[PDB]
Amino acid sequence: SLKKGPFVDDHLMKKVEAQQGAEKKKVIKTWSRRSTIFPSFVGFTIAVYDGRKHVPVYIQEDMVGHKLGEFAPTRTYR
Amino acid sequence: QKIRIRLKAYEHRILDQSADKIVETAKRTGADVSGPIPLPTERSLYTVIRATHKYKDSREQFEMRTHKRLIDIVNPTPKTVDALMKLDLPSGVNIEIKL
Amino acid sequence: QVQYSGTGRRKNAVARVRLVPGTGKITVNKKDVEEYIPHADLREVINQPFGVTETKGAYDVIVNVNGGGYAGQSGAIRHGIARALLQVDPDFRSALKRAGLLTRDARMVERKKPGLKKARKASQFSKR
Amino acid sequence: GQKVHPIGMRVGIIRDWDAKWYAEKEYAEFLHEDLRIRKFIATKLADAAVSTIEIERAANRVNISIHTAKPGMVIGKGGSEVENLRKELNKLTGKRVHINIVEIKKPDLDAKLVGEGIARQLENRVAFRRAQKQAIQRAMRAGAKGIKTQVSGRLNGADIARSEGYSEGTVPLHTLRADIDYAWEEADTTYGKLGVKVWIYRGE
Amino acid sequence: AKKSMIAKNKRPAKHSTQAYTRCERCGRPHSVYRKFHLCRICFRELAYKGQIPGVKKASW
Amino acid sequence: PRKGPVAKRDVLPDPIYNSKLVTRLINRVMVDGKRGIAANIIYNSFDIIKESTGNDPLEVFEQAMKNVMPVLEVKARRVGGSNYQVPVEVRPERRTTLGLRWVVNYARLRGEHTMEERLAKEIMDAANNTGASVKKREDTHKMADANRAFAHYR
RNA sequence: AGCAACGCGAAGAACCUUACCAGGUCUUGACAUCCUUUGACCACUCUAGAGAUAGAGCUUUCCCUUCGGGGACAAAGUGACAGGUGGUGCAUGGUUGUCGUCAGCUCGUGUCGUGAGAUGUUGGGUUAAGUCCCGCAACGAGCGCAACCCUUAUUGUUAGUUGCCAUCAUUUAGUUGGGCACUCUAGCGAGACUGCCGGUGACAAACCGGAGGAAGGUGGGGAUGACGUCAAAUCAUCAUGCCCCUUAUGACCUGGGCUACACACGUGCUACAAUGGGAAGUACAACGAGUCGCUAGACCGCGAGGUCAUGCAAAUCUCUUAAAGCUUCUCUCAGUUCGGAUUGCAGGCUGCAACUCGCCUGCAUGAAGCCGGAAUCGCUAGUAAUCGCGGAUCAGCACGCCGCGGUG
Numbered sequence A: 001s002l003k004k005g006p007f008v009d010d011h012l013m014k015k016v017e018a019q020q021g022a023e024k025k026k027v028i029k030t031w032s033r034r035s036t037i038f039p040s041f042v043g044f045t046i047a048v049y050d051g052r053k054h055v056p057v058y059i060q061e062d063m064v065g066h067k068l069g070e071f072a073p074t075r076t077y078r
Numbered sequence B: 001q002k003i004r005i006r007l008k009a010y011e012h013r014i015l016d017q018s019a020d021k022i023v024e025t026a027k028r029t030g031a032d033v034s035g036p037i038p039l040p041t042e043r044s045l046y047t048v049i050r051a052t053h054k055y056k057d058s059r060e061q062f063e064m065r066t067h068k069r070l071i072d073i074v075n076p077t078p079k080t081v082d083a084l085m086k087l088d089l090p091s092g093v094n095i096e097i098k099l
Numbered sequence C: 001q002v003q004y005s006g007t008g009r010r011k012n013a014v015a016r017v018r019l020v021p022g023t024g025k026i027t028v029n030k031k032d033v034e035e036y037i038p039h040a041d042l043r044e045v046i047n048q049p050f051g052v053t054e055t056k057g058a059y060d061v062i063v064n065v066n067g068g069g070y071a072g073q074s075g076a077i078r079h080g081i082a083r084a085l086l087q088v089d090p091d092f093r094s095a096l097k098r099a100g101l102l103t104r105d106a107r108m109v110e111r112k113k114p115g116l117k118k119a120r121k122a123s124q125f126s127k128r
Numbered sequence D: 001g002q003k004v005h006p007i008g009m010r011v012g013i014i015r016d017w018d019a020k021w022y023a024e025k026e027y028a029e030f031l032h033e034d035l036r037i038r039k040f041i042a043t044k045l046a047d048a049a050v051s052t053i054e055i056e057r058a059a060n061r062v063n064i065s066i067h068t069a070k071p072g073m074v075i076g077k078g079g080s081e082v083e084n085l086r087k088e089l090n091k092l093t094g095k096r097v098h099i100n101i102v103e104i105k106k107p108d109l110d111a112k113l114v115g116e117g118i119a120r121q122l123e124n125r126v127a128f129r130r131a132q133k134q135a136i137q138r139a140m141r142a143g144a145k146g147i148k149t150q151v152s153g154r155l156n157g158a159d160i161a162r163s164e165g166y167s168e169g170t171v172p173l174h175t176l177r178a179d180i181d182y183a184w185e186e187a188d189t190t191y192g193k194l195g196v197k198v199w200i201y202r203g204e
Numbered sequence E: 001a002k003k004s005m006i007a008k009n010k011r012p013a014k015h016s017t018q019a020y021t022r023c024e025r026c027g028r029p030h031s032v033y034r035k036f037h038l039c040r041i042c043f044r045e046l047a048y049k050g051q052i053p054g055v056k057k058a059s060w
Numbered sequence F: 001p002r003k004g005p006v007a008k009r010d011v012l013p014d015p016i017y018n019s020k021l022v023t024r025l026i027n028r029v030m031v032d033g034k035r036g037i038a039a040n041i042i043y044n045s046f047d048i049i050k051e052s053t054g055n056d057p058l059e060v061f062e063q064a065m066k067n068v069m070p071v072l073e074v075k076a077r078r079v080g081g082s083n084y085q086v087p088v089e090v091r092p093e094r095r096t097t098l099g100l101r102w103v104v105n106y107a108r109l110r111g112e113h114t115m116e117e118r119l120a121k122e123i124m125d126a127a128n129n130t131g132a133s134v135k136k137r138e139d140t141h142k143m144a145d146a147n148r149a150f151a152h153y154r
Numbered sequence G: 001a002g003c004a005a006c007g008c009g010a011a012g013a014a015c016c017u018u019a020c021c022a023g024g025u026c027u028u029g030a031c032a033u034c035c036u037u038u039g040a041c042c043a044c045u046c047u048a049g050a051g052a053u054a055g056a057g058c059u060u061u062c063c064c065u066u067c068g069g070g071g072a073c074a075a076a077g078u079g080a081c082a083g084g085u086g087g088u089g090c091a092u093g094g095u096u097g098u099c100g101u102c103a104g105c106u107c108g109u110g111u112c113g114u115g116a117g118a119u120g121u122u123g124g125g126u127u128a129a130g131u132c133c134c135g136c137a138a139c140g141a142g143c144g145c146a147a148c149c150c151u152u153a154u155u156g157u158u159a160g161u162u163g164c165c166a167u168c169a170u171u172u173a174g175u176u177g178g179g180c181a182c183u184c185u186a187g188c189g190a191g192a193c194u195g196c197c198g199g200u201g202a203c204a205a206a207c208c209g210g211a212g213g214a215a216g217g218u219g220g221g222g223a224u225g226a227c228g229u230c231a232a233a234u235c236a237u238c239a240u241g242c243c244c245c246u247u248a249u250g251a252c253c254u255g256g257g258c259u260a261c262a263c264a265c266g267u268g269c270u271a272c273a274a275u276g277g278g279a280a281g282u283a284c285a286a287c288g289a290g291u292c293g294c295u296a297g298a299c300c301g302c303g304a305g306g307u308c309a310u311g312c313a314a315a316u317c318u319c320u321u322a323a324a325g326c327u328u329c330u331c332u333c334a335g336u337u338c339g340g341a342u343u344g345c346a347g348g349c350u351g352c353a354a355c356u357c358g359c360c361u362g363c364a365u366g367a368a369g370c371c372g373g374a375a376u377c378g379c380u381a382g383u384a385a386u387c388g389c390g391g392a393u394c395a396g397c398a399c400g401c402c403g404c405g406g407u408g
């Protein structure tokens, strides 16, 4: 509930601003699971570290307010 | 009345002793010192587990009382100020003189 | 005027009562005893000393009460009224003495002990 | 574990605090400064046999008093050692310090002194049965209502630990107006640690 | 590891909510009183010996 | 206990009717120490008694008590590994204890919309030799005066 | 790890704590001493990086001088060395649990016995008590029991401010003039001793009854735990003998478990309703906490809350109008105007940051549950049952823990 502006990280936002020009790369590999999905993250493919590996997640549009950690679970049940 | 004391201590013996010191050396050179009025003696309480590893259901309790005492001076004189700000005994008792 | 004063204590409550000749009435904390303790019938506990000795009127009662609950500070009022009546004529210290009405009830709240749920209730046990 | 500390049962009843100052909002700093002081001056104590130490303090000065049994061997030739104590303690406390050295009379009637001395024999390969016996013998001759000692650990430098002590005269422990003394020390011969405890009854 | 952690406790913390108290004699991190800066069972040890001024055993 | 018999727990007679029995009846209705509610309940019930086909609440209450209290109770005992039951007499305080207990228990299970509509109705039904309380008494008297068989030399 | 483990170590896991795991890193070292070159070390700014770190920028710059030295300190060298929450509670110190606040454990002078040993300390009565009496080859003594310490029940005296307001004027009011009478606060004293009176009993100890008194038979509660038992618990509070690691079992950083779920056991909270649910009005406490803390008051928001601002380092101000209670108006025996789990959407607060994994608010949804078999637990009076309030730990986070009082 960060009604004082949502929360990205500078490194993550720096990288996305840098690629904002042309067609994008899958190599955006950040740990950063606290960041929310700003409406500019669409079409990219972010790699989210889940404590063990870097899972890739493709950003559609319906996922636009959630966090980057909601798409890379950590527990491994069955 | 434009001069008053406050004394805190952990032992009422030392407390009353020093209060009588100041009252006596005040009414020796002046007059009309309001009695050493007693204040309500704050208390705290500390509960602790008395074993290093287990056994929560047996404890030991501690405390620390703080006795208080009030003295107001009426109609001071250019000698009471002197004869008061000089006496200092004893060690572990708090003194705070506010006009 | 003439008046009679007594002090009554019961269970964290202390009352300061004044007897004054009149027609039979009691007011407490600038309100009427029908409204201050309007519970049901604790008033019939208060008017017991008048019922047993100095039967039964007539004194207006003025009291100042503070502390405890509504049932403690009425037994305290009774205590005080009894002491004041004793003050009027010392010949009452027999009829009152027979029927209690003169003693302090030393039944206070027992302190909690560690390792126990309450002052005496302990935790639930299982032999295995 | 079924006995209370006998000089913590009695503190605030018939005995006083070994630290007498009143402060608020400067209390943690003072308590740890006292701890530092007292944990330092166990340097000379290693030879000079000090028993207690009393810390008082004023506006910015710190009044100290130590009870010893060696007055000259702790102050110097003409006063060349108290000088060092003060000029060293100033480097810690950053204040003014004023040691007022007391001297102890009848030192065989003191719990820390006795127990620390009869815990130095154990290190020099001495049998314990006569160390404690001679300790209580030289504590009774000074005149004392009762004394009790106890050593623990691997005795004789041997296998599995045990315990045993000896008593002389009465030492009532449940009486609150009793003025008993107590101390607990340590030592080794070559195996582990040993624990020596000593209680002395000196009337009330 | 309890000699590097006392060192890491005294350096300034990386964020506001990263500092935490420890005992001062030992380095116990659980159950420390922040009027004395002493843990659960150094308090009970220095209360006896009458070194902490004030504190004594309570009964009522 | 083990040492020997104990006292009897003196009671304080309520001031309205000046009757220690009404005091115990108030004490038995009360749950959780909420006594003013129990007092209001008993007084509304007695108002209901007198107002509707009544004479005085003390009179009909005493008669209902008289018709309910037991006079022969049995006690199931153990001897050496086989257990039985034998009748015995009944001391006075236990009698009123049981009476109050049954009346309150079986008024609490009535099935109307108020504890007063239950209590007044039940002690009226009791003062006319009716109601599960009287039937409980008679069950007790029938268990006794029969199980005296293996009680005749106990 | 049965009683004596299982709301226990933990009196505070989002990061920290943190020992565990995965990736990225260092090797005289995160922390200590020594010796030498020597000596004043910094912090701040900018690029790369998840950070750890590395690369560049103003520079860590003699505070003792007799011209001859000493304190702080970076690097280096330099190796002595450091470092270990790694093993062994069956090698230990110290600190606890339980029998259990049960009433026991020994000695000196005598006597008895060929001797190890016994007696005392056995027997009757009484007692909470190895607590007392009578008898008895025993007579006396020590630690244990009880007393001395704390708090609560009654009062005299000394002292009346920040407490209190009975005889007076005054206002919104104990407020302001006045007073210390009363309550209160807290120093010093009194008072309870089978001390008197009747009966029982070996006339004894002791028990039953009475008078007086606030209190009567250890008045009520706490602290206080003998010799010993379980190789009971703890090398992870701390120490420490022996063994083990040392470019790694040591050390630094980010992200993840410690919160996983076909189930089984323990300790709790909320309910299954009318002795109740909902709406409006009216009352009565005590223990405690507060300086970058406790927030008066006024306004904005349905609410949790927010803004401007005020007093107080405290018998002065604030947290703090307690909740059950009482009085009215409803609802009518139903899976319901009971119950409040679960889920959808929208917010607030702390924090650099609440996805895994916080607390709170509003609107919507409305599960099981209609008093619970075998079996089993707590409690002898202001107790059980029931109702709220405070604080240690703590940015935040309690159905747990420690205390307090109300009805009873």
Ligand SMILES: [Zn+2]
Residues within 6 Å of the ligand: E023, E024, E025, E026, E027, E028, E038, E039, E040, E041, E042, E043
């Ligand atoms: Zn500690």
